[PDB]
Amino acid sequence: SGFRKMAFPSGKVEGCMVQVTCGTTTLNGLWLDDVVYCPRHVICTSEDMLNPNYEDLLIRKSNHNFLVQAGNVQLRVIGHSMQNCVLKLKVDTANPKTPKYKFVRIQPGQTFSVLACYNGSPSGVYQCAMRPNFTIKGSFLNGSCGSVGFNIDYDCVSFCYMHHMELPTGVHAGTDLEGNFYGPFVDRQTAQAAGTDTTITVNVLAWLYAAVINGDRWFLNRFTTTLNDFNLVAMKYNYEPLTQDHVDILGPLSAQTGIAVLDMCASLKELLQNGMNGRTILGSALLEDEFTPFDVVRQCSGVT
Amino acid sequence: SGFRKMAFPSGKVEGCMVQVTCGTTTLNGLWLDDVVYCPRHVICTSEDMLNPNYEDLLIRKSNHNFLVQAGNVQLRVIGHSMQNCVLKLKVDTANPKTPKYKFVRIQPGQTFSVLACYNGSPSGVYQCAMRPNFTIKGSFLNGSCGSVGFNIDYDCVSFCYMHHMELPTGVHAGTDLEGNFYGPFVDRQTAQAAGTDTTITVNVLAWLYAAVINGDRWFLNRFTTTLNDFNLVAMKYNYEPLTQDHVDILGPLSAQTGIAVLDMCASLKELLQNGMNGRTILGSALLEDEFTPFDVVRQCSGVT
Numbered sequence: 001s002g003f004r005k006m007a008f009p010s011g012k013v014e015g016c017m018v019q020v021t022c023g024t025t026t027l028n029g030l031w032l033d034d035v036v037y038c039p040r041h042v043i044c045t046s047e048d049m050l051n052p053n054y055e056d057l058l059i060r061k062s063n064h065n066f067l068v069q070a071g072n073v074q075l076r077v078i079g080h081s082m083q084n085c086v087l088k089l090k091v092d093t094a095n096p097k098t099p100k101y102k103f104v105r106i107q108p109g110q111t112f113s114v115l116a117c118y119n120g121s122p123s124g125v126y127q128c129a130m131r132p133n134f135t136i137k138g139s140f141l142n143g144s145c146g147s148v149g150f151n152i153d154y155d156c157v158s159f160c161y162m163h164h165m166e167l168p169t170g171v172h173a174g175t176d177l178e179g180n181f182y183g184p185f186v187d188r189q190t191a192q193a194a195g196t197d198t199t200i201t202v203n204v205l206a207w208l209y210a211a212v213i214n215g216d217r218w219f220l221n222r223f224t225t226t227l228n229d230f231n232l233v234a235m236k237y238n239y240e241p242l243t244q245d246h247v248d249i250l251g252p253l254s255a256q257t258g259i260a261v262l263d264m265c266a267s268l269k270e271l272l273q274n275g276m277n278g279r280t281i282l283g284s285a286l287l288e289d290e291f292t293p294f295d296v297v298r299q300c301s302g303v304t
Numbered sequence: 305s306g307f308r309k310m311a312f313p314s315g316k317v318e319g320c321m322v323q324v325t326c327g328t329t330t331l332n333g334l335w336l337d338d339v340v341y342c343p344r345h346v347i348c349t350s351e352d353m354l355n356p357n358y359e360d361l362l363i364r365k366s367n368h369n370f371l372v373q374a375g376n377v378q379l380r381v382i383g384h385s386m387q388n389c390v391l392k393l394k395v396d397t398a399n400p401k402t403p404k405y406k407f408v409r410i411q412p413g414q415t416f417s418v419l420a421c422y423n424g425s426p427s428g429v430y431q432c433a434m435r436p437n438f439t440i441k442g443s444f445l446n447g448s449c450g451s452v453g454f455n456i457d458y459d460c461v462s463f464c465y466m467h468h469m470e471l472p473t474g475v476h477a478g479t480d481l482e483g484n485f486y487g488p489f490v491d492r493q494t495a496q497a498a499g500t501d502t503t504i505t506v507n508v509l510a511w512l513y514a515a516v517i518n519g520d521r522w523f524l525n526r527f528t529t530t531l532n533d534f535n536l537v538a539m540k541y542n543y544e545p546l547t548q549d550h551v552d553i554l555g556p557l558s559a560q561t562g563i564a565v566l567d568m569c570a571s572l573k574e575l576l577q578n579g580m581n582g583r584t585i586l587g588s589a590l591l592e593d594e595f596t597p598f599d600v601v602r603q604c605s606g607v608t
């Protein structure tokens with residue numbers, strides 16, 4: 001028992017982190033096979049952060065200008081290309097620690113672990129969620145760019161995020177491993193305000209199921225609701241609308257606890273309307289939304 | 305910017321996890337050099353969980369009865385001994401992935417990361433704190449025994465905890481790597497109630513400093529207090545007493561933010577007396593106490 005914000009074991013990803021330097025900018029790169037992936041803004045100086053023309057800036061760069069270091073040893077760059085907002089640096093050596101991997105583009109509400117790195121070295125691992133406004137609430141300092149987000153299925157790492165920037169509001173923006181930003185964000189120092197950070201309703205319900213499984217049951221009420229009634233309350237509280245797909249995904253948790261999804265929705269509705277009244281659920285005084293139904297099942301079953 | 309409950313990168317510890325089986329019980333072991341460390345209750349059956357006599361149970365066990373498997377390969381056990389509540393299984397092979405390591409016994413309030421494992425395989429990593437009542441609020445299912453807690457200083461892993469059991473209240477009890485339990489807990493299925501889980505005051509202050517550094521300043525008030533006045537309020541709220549050592553340890557955070565420790569104590573005092581009023585600090589609706597002053601500095605500076 002017990003329920004924690006758990007990240008995937010980071011070992012497989014630690015073995016992929018390298019340092020990339022271009023001119024005076026140093027950030028992190030992800031080394032998979034003979035390719036090092038990093039944010040294309042590694043080529044940017046100070047005088048051109050406001051409106052960079054990446055194709056133009058890249059013309060002035062050659063293979064030897066990208067310094068890639070894995071541990072304390074230098075990798076030889078034999079090719080470079082820009083794919084969307086990422087640079088792909090072909091090196092002459094395949095990473096011997098390359099795990100089985102995939103590049104996936106996640107949807108909002110989906111969770112992943114972040115291996116925060118500086119100078120190609122891992123500093124920490126934490127669990128994130130792609131917010132409905134396509135930002136992530138990470139912990140990233142200068143030099144953390146190129147740190148990646150991932151999920152692991154047994155021995156296959158699915159890379160889903162690469163850190164690129166921090167918005168003026170202290171929230172984070174990044175790309176998938178094909179270089180496409182999540183959301184409307186661009187890699188330039190400009191006014192980029194995030195949209196409404198709504199609560200991931202399906203995740204909150206999953207976490208309420210995790211609370212019941214772990215003995216926290218005080219919030220369970222005598223009520224039920226409908227998807228349409230619940231959604232009127234969810235809209236009022238800036239919660240994402242709950243769909244029949246979400247109800248279906250919560251089915252295994254509903255089955256394990258014997259609590260119908262719509263009954264849990266009614267409990268959630270009363271929590272939104274009445275508040276916690278100074279009480280806690282799984283050690284939290286707010287409704288946690290960064291656990292998917294899959295994470296709750298995985299953690300409560302012990303998937304390795 | 306951004307502040308997350310961050311665990312250490314787990315790679316160095318993943319390379320040490322093995323599966324230990326004795327009879328029909330399978331748990332995790334920690335393989336460092338040619339020794340595999342695991343909870344001694346791996347020798348216990350069902351008929352003797354209530355009052356085990358470990359020395360007597362161990363007489364019936366030989367080296368060949370302890371099955372150690374690292375990955376998909378079996379290790380040869382050439383010796384076994386009991387040190388307090390841990391078994392040390394000498395194997396014929398030194399772990400090639402043994403990192404630089406130390407065994408440390410932490411104090412209450414100190415934090416560490418847990419690599420939760422099942423069948424010698426890592427499932428997840430999370431950050432814990434040794435509670436003032438010597439329990440940990442972990443996430444551990446059956447078979448998680450032998451999972452370890454650790455801190456990392458650059459390339460040296462300091463192992464501080466090994467998971468042994470879950471108390472009837474769903475909190476966790478374990479030992480240091482010398483086999484000595486934290487707190488008064490024993491490895492037997494008996495009535496073991498935990499003491500008062502007080503809040504780690506120095507950690508809350510560290511986290512309030514982290515909030516100020518990250519832009520969350522609404523709780524900063526116009527007041528100050530003394531250590532004795534603050535401690536009268538801390539006692540009332542089941543917070544640990546704050547000492548001059550704690551004030552000294554918070555010095556770098558006080559220096560970085562320009563907020564005197566006793567002024568932050570007065571802010572904390574008003575938060576205890578008035579509540580959050582539905583507001584949040586660093587995305588939390590309660591006062592977080594599982595970040596030490598060292599963790600706040602490390603995370604806010606980017607130590608790798």
Ligand SMILES: *[C@@H](C)C(=O)N(c1ccc(C(C)(C)C)cc1)[C@@H](C(=O)NCCC(=O)OCC)c1cccnc1
Pocket residue numbers: 027041044048049050140141142143144145146164165166167168187188189190191192305
């Ligand atoms: C990470 C590489 C870094 O230190 N930056 C950063 C990212 C992107 C640029 C760019 C303007 C050339 C694309 C420059 C520097 C930090 C950062 O985001 N700075 C603010 C600029 C920005 O993002 O403007 C968009 C609104 C950074 C700091 C902390 C955490 N992550 C990134």
Ligand SMILES: *[C@@H](C)C(=O)N(c1ccc(C(C)(C)C)cc1)[C@@H](C(=O)NCCC(=O)OCC)c1cccnc1
Pocket residue numbers: 001331345348352353354444445446447448449450468469470471472491492493494495496
């Ligand atoms: C972990 C090895 C395990 O599955 N146990 C466990 C631990 C200790 C014993 C022992 C009674 C022989 C020492 C047996 C089994 C779980 C556990 O703690 N069971 C309850 C017995 C207990 O701890 O009694 C003391 C009050 C366990 C489950 C979930 C998480 N951790 C451990």
